[PDB]
Each structure stands twice: as C-alpha cells, then as structure tokens.
Scaffold this motif. Structure first.
Motif, PDB file in Angstrom:
ATOM      1  N   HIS A 135       0.839  -1.456   0.145  1.00 26.20           N
ATOM      2  CA  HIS A 135       0.288  -0.268  -0.027  1.00 26.20           C
ATOM      3  C   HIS A 135       0.437   1.622   0.110  1.00 26.20           C
ATOM      4  N   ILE A 136       0.312   2.212  -0.617  1.00 24.96           N
ATOM      5  CA  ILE A 136       1.093   3.927  -0.392  1.00 24.96           C
ATOM      6  C   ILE A 136      -0.051   4.729  -0.276  1.00 24.96           C
ATOM      7  N   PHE A 137       0.185   5.083   0.700  1.00 28.69           N
ATOM      8  CA  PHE A 137      -0.278   6.066   1.240  1.00 28.69           C
ATOM      9  C   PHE A 137      -0.465   7.724   0.730  1.00 28.69           C
ATOM     10  N   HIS A 138      -1.478   8.807   0.056  1.00 33.62           N
ATOM     11  CA  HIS A 138      -0.813  10.378  -0.226  1.00 33.62           C
ATOM     12  C   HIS A 138      -0.753  10.805   0.571  1.00 33.62           C
ATOM     13  N   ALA A 139       0.849  11.852   0.349  1.00 33.40           N
ATOM     14  CA  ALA A 139       1.274  13.206   1.285  1.00 33.40           C
ATOM     15  C   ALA A 139       0.630  13.566   1.730  1.00 33.40           C
ATOM     16  N   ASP A 140      -1.171  14.313   1.349  1.00 32.33           N
ATOM     17  CA  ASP A 140      -1.845  14.699   1.752  1.00 32.33           C
ATOM     18  C   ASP A 140      -2.653  14.089   2.768  1.00 32.33           C
ATOM     19  N   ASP A 141      -2.299  12.630   2.496  1.00 30.55           N
ATOM     20  CA  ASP A 141      -3.454  12.105   3.785  1.00 30.55           C
ATOM     21  C   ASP A 141      -2.590  11.776   4.962  1.00 30.55           C
ATOM     22  N   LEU A 142      -1.054  11.900   4.991  1.00 35.19           N
ATOM     23  CA  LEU A 142      -0.332  11.246   5.743  1.00 35.19           C
ATOM     24  C   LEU A 142      -0.050  12.773   6.661  1.00 35.19           C
ATOM     25  N   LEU A 143       0.342  13.880   6.242  1.00 30.95           N
ATOM     26  CA  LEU A 143       0.207  15.491   6.738  1.00 30.95           C
ATOM     27  C   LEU A 143      -1.259  15.721   7.401  1.00 30.95           C
ATOM     28  N   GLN A 144      -1.725  15.194   6.958  1.00 31.74           N
ATOM     29  CA  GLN A 144      -3.532  15.707   7.342  1.00 31.74           C
ATOM     30  C   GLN A 144      -3.194  15.039   9.282  1.00 31.74           C
ATOM     31  N   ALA A 145      -2.365  13.583   9.004  1.00 42.63           N
ATOM     32  CA  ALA A 145      -3.010  12.532  10.105  1.00 42.63           C
ATOM     33  C   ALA A 145      -2.151  13.008  11.254  1.00 42.63           C
ATOM     34  N   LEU A 146      -0.165  13.708  10.390  1.00 45.49           N
ATOM     35  CA  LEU A 146       0.162  13.627  11.711  1.00 45.49           C
ATOM     36  C   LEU A 146       0.446  15.099  11.711  1.00 45.49           C
ATOM     37  N   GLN A 147      -0.710  16.206  11.326  1.00 45.10           N
ATOM     38  CA  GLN A 147      -0.619  17.119  12.357  1.00 45.10           C
ATOM     39  C   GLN A 147      -1.915  16.835  13.223  1.00 45.10           C
ATOM     40  N   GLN A 148      -2.515  15.720  13.299  1.00 46.11           N
ATOM     41  CA  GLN A 148      -3.902  15.972  14.498  1.00 46.11           C
ATOM     42  C   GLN A 148      -2.996  15.433  15.750  1.00 46.11           C
ATOM     43  N   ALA A 149      -2.125  14.657  15.073  1.00 49.16           N
ATOM     44  CA  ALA A 149      -1.475  14.053  16.310  1.00 49.16           C
ATOM     45  C   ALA A 149      -0.857  14.379  16.635  1.00 49.16           C
ATOM     46  N   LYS A 150       0.004  15.559  15.843  1.00 51.46           N
ATOM     47  CA  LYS A 150       0.614  16.254  17.030  1.00 51.46           C
ATOM     48  C   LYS A 150      -0.208  17.739  17.928  1.00 51.46           C
ATOM     49  N   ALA A 151      -1.590  17.993  17.439  1.00 47.26           N
ATOM     50  CA  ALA A 151      -2.068  18.783  18.366  1.00 47.26           C
ATOM     51  C   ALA A 151      -2.774  18.088  19.512  1.00 47.26           C
ATOM     52  N   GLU A 152      -2.983  15.837  19.280  1.00 49.45           N
ATOM     53  CA  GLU A 152      -3.476  15.765  20.320  1.00 49.45           C
ATOM     54  C   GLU A 152      -2.277  15.043  21.311  1.00 49.45           C
ATOM     55  N   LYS A 153      -0.734  15.703  20.868  1.00 48.67           N
ATOM     56  CA  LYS A 153      -0.008  14.931  21.864  1.00 48.67           C
ATOM     57  C   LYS A 153       0.200  13.391  21.990  1.00 48.67           C
ATOM     58  N   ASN A 154      -0.392  12.943  20.866  1.00 51.82           N
ATOM     59  CA  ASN A 154      -0.247  11.605  20.592  1.00 51.82           C
ATOM     60  C   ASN A 154      -0.119  10.692  19.628  1.00 51.82           C
ATOM     61  N   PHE A 155       1.679  10.537  19.620  1.00 50.82           N
ATOM     62  CA  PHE A 155       2.214  10.101  17.985  1.00 50.82           C
ATOM     63  C   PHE A 155       1.798   8.625  18.134  1.00 50.82           C
ATOM     64  N   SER A 156       1.775   7.522  19.221  1.00 54.12           N
ATOM     65  CA  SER A 156       2.059   6.682  18.888  1.00 54.12           C
ATOM     66  C   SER A 156       0.201   6.880  18.312  1.00 54.12           C
ATOM     67  N   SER A 157      -0.628   7.007  18.311  1.00 48.93           N
ATOM     68  CA  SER A 157      -2.469   6.971  18.254  1.00 48.93           C
ATOM     69  C   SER A 157      -1.619   6.643  15.691  1.00 48.93           C
ATOM     70  N   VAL A 158      -0.766   7.322  15.533  1.00 44.95           N
ATOM     71  CA  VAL A 158      -0.643   6.978  13.839  1.00 44.95           C
ATOM     72  C   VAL A 158       0.869   6.369  13.844  1.00 44.95           C
ATOM     73  N   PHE A 159       1.496   6.670  14.852  1.00 48.28           N
ATOM     74  CA  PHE A 159       3.414   5.704  14.281  1.00 48.28           C
ATOM     75  C   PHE A 159       3.572   5.144  15.797  1.00 48.28           C
ATOM     76  N   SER A 160       4.449   4.035  14.864  1.00 50.59           N
ATOM     77  CA  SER A 160       4.370   2.401  15.595  1.00 50.59           C
ATOM     78  C   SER A 160       5.444   2.228  15.242  1.00 50.59           C
ATOM     79  N   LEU A 161       6.747   2.051  15.739  1.00 52.87           N
ATOM     80  CA  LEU A 161       7.313   1.042  15.668  1.00 52.87           C
ATOM     81  C   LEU A 161       8.037  -0.911  16.294  1.00 52.87           C
ATOM     82  N   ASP A 162       7.761  -1.727  15.513  1.00 56.57           N
ATOM     83  CA  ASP A 162       7.553  -2.499  15.572  1.00 56.57           C
ATOM     84  C   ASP A 162       8.694  -3.728  16.647  1.00 56.57           C
ATOM     85  N   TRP A 163       8.749  -2.983  18.193  1.00 55.06           N
ATOM     86  CA  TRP A 163       9.604  -3.132  19.189  1.00 55.06           C
ATOM     87  C   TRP A 163       9.090  -5.383  19.101  1.00 55.06           C
TER      88      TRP A 163
END
Length: 274
Positions: A1-29
């Motif tokens: 799958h390929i994410f569209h830049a616009d959607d990705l930016l809109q989703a990291l802006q909203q996580a930034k505002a919600e102080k919650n990055f792990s809602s969209v970014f996750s490393l498979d530890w």
C-alpha cells in the motif's frame, strides 16, 4: 500500500495537536532493522508514501574525474569533487530562498526588526511531513525498550552547517537517498521523464534518458537530475536502522518522475521580459 502525502500530513498534524504520536506512528519492537508502521484513514501498513511538486535544490556531483573537470571549468565559484557516496535529492523548507545578505547566511530584516520569510504558499509540503516524522521517531525512541533509549539518535533534517561552520541555516534541508546497489552498480529506483507522457496498454511516462539515449545509471545521474528540477515520486521509509552510532530513519526514493528546470515558463512578469 502507498499512503497519499496529503492524508499522511493531515494525520500527523492531528496527532501532533492531540499530543499523541503513537496513535499513528509505531515501531515493531553490527546492524539491525526494525519496521515502521503508520495508521492513516484507519489503515495500518508499513510506511510508504508519495509526493508531488517538490523542488530539488543542489548539485549531484559526478562519478568520473573527466566530468568533475568539465563542471568546474564552467562554474568556478561552486566547485564539486568526485562522488563517493550515493546521490541525494535535497528539498528545503521554502521553495524560494528568503532575502539573504551578501555573506549568504544572515537573513535581511524589515521595518520592525523582523526577519523576512516567504509566504506559506512557498512552504514545501514534503518538508512538513519530514519534520513531523522526525518528531514521531523522536517520541517513539525514548518511549521504547530499555537498551535503545540510551543511544544516539540521528536527525532527519539539517538545520545548521556542520564543519564558516556551525551557523544556523536560513533554509533547512531534508534529503532523500537514491540508492546504488554496490554489488551490481545498478541504480535502484525507477526513473521517468515528466516531459514524455506515453500511452498505456490500458497514460504513463517514458523512462528517463540522457543525450545518448541511455537510461539513468551512476554515470548518467548527475546530468539527469540537475538543480531546480521538479520531482514527483514514491518514498520507502519502511524501517529504522540500529547500530553502534545510534538509530537512523533513512528515506529512499523508490520511484521518481523528473521535470527539468525551464526558463520562461508560466504566466508571470518574468516571462514578459526576456
């Protein structure tokens, strides 16, 4: 799958505002790779996204000494040396440089002492994504396992000169790596020419080729990707790198469409004269 830049930016802006990055970014530890997953419009997948309309600013150095002589013989102010690493695409925060002084690093000021910067219409959207991915990577690493947390994190974006040194850049830089396979000497991403639309067995573009008709390779590339070209493509940011010197978040071009710089384009006052 390929994410569209616009959607990705809109989703990291909203996580930034919600102080919650792990809602969209996750490393498979030696070296070791760990997967980067992302969630966008409800879909979870490893991080690959597209980009459009991004201005490369920089000079890819050539691979043969003959080409170094030629480029230097007609550009004596900005000398290059023979290339000894993979080429990079360079995308600044602003698509035009802010008014700079003659020393080339201090930004002119205005009537109330305020440093001038271009309007937001000149902000690079890809740079904005890479800014927030760097924060997510940062947030992720100090929130993870014990052995990694105390190791050195390598930054994504250059904000000052390294080694005139150390002074802060007026237009910071994000870099996209174009990989060359070292065993085979073959350029890894597929490269197309925006100026050559073609007809699909089904509306594509011809492969990108130099004066003598040869496809992009390591001897070509400095001629085919010049400064101020406009780029569209697909980026692989699927994984982080862990070693000795720390943790890296590399970004590699997997596909690119390339449009060479042209003067007297577009309806503006610069095309009315000259």
């Amino acid at each position: 799958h390929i994410f569209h830049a616009d959607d990705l930016l809109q989703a990291l802006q909203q996580a930034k505002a919600e102080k919650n990055f792990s809602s969209v970014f996750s490393l498979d530890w030696t070296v070791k790779y760990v997967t980067v997953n992302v969630i966008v419009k409800g879909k979870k997948a490893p991080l690959m996204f597209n980009f459009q309309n991004e201005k490369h600013v920089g000079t890819i150095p050539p691979s043969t000494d003959e080409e170094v002589i030629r480029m230097n013989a007609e550009n004596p102010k900005f000398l290059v040396k023979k290339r000894d690493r993979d080429p990079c695409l360079q995308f600044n925060k602003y698509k035009i440089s802010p008014p700079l002084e003659d020393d080339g690093l201090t930004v002119k000021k205005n009537e109330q002492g305020e440093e001038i910067y271009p309007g937001d219409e000149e902000k690079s959207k890809l740079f904005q994504i890479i800014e927030l991915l760097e924060e997510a990577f940062e947030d992720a690493v100090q929130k993870g396992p014990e052995a990694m947390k105390t190791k050195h994190v390598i930054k994504l974006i250059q904000r000052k000169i390294s080694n005139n040194a150390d002074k802060p850049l007026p237009n910071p830089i994000a870099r996209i790596r174009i990989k060359i396979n070292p065993a085979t000497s073959i350029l890894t991403p597929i490269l197309l020419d925006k100026n050559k639309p073609i007809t699909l067995q089904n509306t594509s573009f011809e492969e990108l080729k130099d004066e003598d008709g040869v496809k992009a390779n390591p001897d070509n590339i400095h001629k085919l990707i010049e400064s101020h070209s406009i780029h569209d493509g697909i980026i692989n940011a699927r994984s982080i790198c862990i070693s000795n010197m720390g943790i890296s978040f590399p970004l590699c071009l997997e596909m690119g469409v390339v449009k060479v710089f042209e003067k007297n384009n577009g309806i503006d006052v610069n095309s009315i004269y000259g």
